[PDB]
Structure 1
């Protein structure tokens, strides 16, 4: 007999990706902490300006983040040396979880290796323990949420993106007593659209569902303190109360939107300048995940210095709203320039500047020309990250992308569009349009963008954050 042809199967599957042009070539990009947002390629002499990083507030290089790392390394070394149950539970872990709980004004928070792992662990456990659970999932949810929902192994319904009429009809089709989960994101990063979190909470109350909210692309960027779009929903109540829970919401009600969301997940690998993921929720939910989630239990704890760096970034960004107003103003500068030039930015009320291409091969060629000819780094985005035919260049301005740098980007993208004769806004219109190329108004209003750090409650500057019992287990 002869064995199965494993290599033949692998070859055929990779060949298909080459054929449809989704096969990926990674770019060697070495970001320079001393020259943000510059990076160098294979050689240090070849520098480029990074315009697609998710280090949204430039805090990966902030002096307070690096100092926290250096000091923690001197004391703790590199690896944690164990798991949370065995030798891997320590003060940096306790401080990080407490800061995250404080940021979202939740009873607790639990740190995982990544938000991918956190989403998978949370969603997996919910379905494994509630086999009658019905999950209602936004069609554009991130791969980590799709995977977690699959692992949950429960009935699921996918509702069209941000379509709350369909969502309600799906929720209506069950008795209220059936356990339900609504899983969605605050900011969907590839096109930058935003969920109506308050209406989803209203639907969850009415039809008896828990809410699972992924704020990976909003933490650090929305709300007065960077706690996410959920915080932005009661912007003035949270700004007035600062670190404290407000007595009423922006509409005069009892509970803020962020308070009403049952589970909020975030990453430490973007705005917070590090690596890792977390869920913030009631202490009972946190203890539940801590006690039952194998992706939490059976893996090495993140290095102490990595946690300390994220902690420093969280604390700094909490009391620096100028990071957020600065990012938004730079994004608006780029968006306005591209609109005047007919550069097809997918309209969104967020910090993302995705430029529609619509062809995987043309997107790669545009990215290659940008980096090789113009020393501008924007990676081409293709399937599976985005649907085939919606390939795009995702530009992410930060507080470090000042107008002088933006002008260089703008001229470079304009030039690449001319060199490759790529479709402009008017050309997408001629074909019927795609992905919006009614625009939602910016999440950050003119009034909010005029706020300074002097407009924050003094209690968010250097707060003393007590460690949480639930991080170690609750004694009865």
Structure 2
């Protein structure tokens, strides 16, 4: 007999168990009628979910559900084909148009997932420019890492958010060498934020494209939820609404969001659905549409799923109260943790990473929270984060009111004592250690938005179907 395939797999699975990164998924059945509750195996066994990426609770929004129900009745479930063959349609057109409008770009292209979007764009760039050099933040997501490998070009990794190191790398190449700077706006495991504007400045100076993943930012930053790039020119964007502003927030001609060449997002988090996208110039979009195999050779997302996301995007654009209440909830939890010496990785975003520092203790903390306190928070271990930096990821939403927060705070405090986990004081004696939303921005209401953001009559893009 030949190779021992079963032996190779056995030993590979055993390494996961011995190093204790072997994952057990929790049966979590999220309740649309009782957000943010979920049930486990039994309907009667409920927990409060504190680690979902349904950041704005739009997965259960009436306009999202209604859009789904109506679309299902008209279109059915599946698209029934690919974009080329029988799977191109009005829900697709409306969604691409909505995303392009959100990022104030010429075009947007929808993919199965942002994982696929990231892989497709990065792969194609590298496969069509073999001389390309990619500069990648060390904390970039798996999707981007995989895309960068697939691109199959020279790559440099820079220390996280270290723009001195990035500039030194950029500088060591002639300007005429094609370059790509690949980064995220908000890094999900730490909640850290990129200086998008400074990166755009570096791109201008050294002749690089910019690729920006706003997956943990869309819905959440900027007056309309277009992301951190929008937040960079918050007041310009707020004044102009849907329109491109006359000037950026410093009185210059171009906004940050305009200067970024390629912006990717998800429909699977804030926008309450599933899918991915890239927003960019008409030329870039047409190129991806025409050449990306991960776009071309795959069933189109169901119409209903697209209709849902479109509804979510439209609603959130003109409901800044979603963001203000999320930020308030987050800040409430963060300040309560600070007072109790519960160690939170400091960040200016909506993510609350509670530092544990140990794989087994993080899993046990998660275990006790769900079984004893009916709180669902997931442990983040290697390989998603560095060994020794293990943590619990907590993500408050507009639905996590202060009464629910109080229960969380009490439970986490309690679990820290039960496991005798290190407090902030203890960490100081012995790691990974200031808010994007300002008080000014946090006191805005929906009345302070440009009325042109309420039910815009958004027209379909020619590029979605092909250009004459």
- For the criterion TM > 0.5, the same-fold answer is yes
What SS does the corresponding residue of 1:193 show, helix, strand or coil? Answer: coil
What SS does the corresponding residue of 1:272 show, helix, strand or coil? Answer: coil
How far did 1:435 drift?
A: 1.0
1:293-320 Cα shifts (integer Å, max 9, x gaps): 0000000000000000000000000000
Cα distance in 1 between the residues matched to 2:71 and 2:380: 36
What SS does the corresponding residue of 1:339 show, helix, strand or coil? Answer: helix
Q: 1:71 — aligned with what?
A: 70
1:317-359 Cα shifts (integer Å, max 9, x gaps): 0000000000000000000000000101100000000101111
How far did 1:394 drift?
A: 0.2
Q: 1:443 — aligned with what?
A: 436
Q: TM-score, normalised by structure 2?
A: 1.00
What SS does the corresponding residue of 2:181 show, helix, strand or coil? Answer: strand
Cα distance in 2 between the residues matched to 1:30 and 1:424: 32
1:345-393 Cα shifts (integer Å, max 9, x gaps): 1000000001011111111100000000000000111122111211110
1:423-452 Cα shifts (integer Å, max 9, x gaps): 111111121xx111xxxx100000000000
1:233-266 Cα shifts (integer Å, max 9, x gaps): 0000000000000011001101000000000000
Number of aligned residues: 468
1:76-122 Cα shifts (integer Å, max 9, x gaps): 00000000000000000000000000000000000000000000000
Task: Return 31-40 or 15-24, whichever deviates more.
Answer: 15-24
1:193-248 Cα shifts (integer Å, max 9, x gaps): 00000000000000000000000000000000000000000000000000000011
What SS does the corresponding residue of 2:353 show, helix, strand or coil? Answer: strand
Task: Return 410-419 or 9-18, whichever deviates more.
Answer: 9-18
List aligned pairs for 1:49-448, cutoff 5 A. 49-431=48-430, 434-436=431-433, 441-448=434-441
Residue of structure 2 aligned with 1:457, choices 441, 446, 450: 450
Cα distance in 2 between the residues matched to 1:145 and 1:429: 34
What SS does the corresponding residue of 2:224 show, helix, strand or coil? Answer: coil
Task: After the TM superposition, list the runs of 4 or more consecutive aligned residues in structure 1 that deviate by more than 3 angstroms.
Answer: none
What's the Cα RMSD here? 0.5
Q: TM-score, normalised by structure 1?
A: 0.98
Cα distance in 1 between the residues matched to 2:286 and 2:359: 44
What SS does the corresponding residue of 2:368 show, helix, strand or coil? Answer: helix
Cα distance in 2 between the residues matched to 1:192 and 1:406: 19
Structure 1, unpaired ranges of 5+: none
1:170-199 Cα shifts (integer Å, max 9, x gaps): 000010000000000000010100000000
Cα distance in 2 between the residues matched to 1:273 and 1:387: 29
What SS does the corresponding residue of 1:211 show, helix, strand or coil? Answer: strand
Cα distance in 1 between the residues matched to 2:30 and 2:383: 26
Cα distance in 2 between the residues matched to 1:389 and 1:204: 34
How far did 1:400 drift?
A: 0.2
How far did 1:70 drift?
A: 0.1
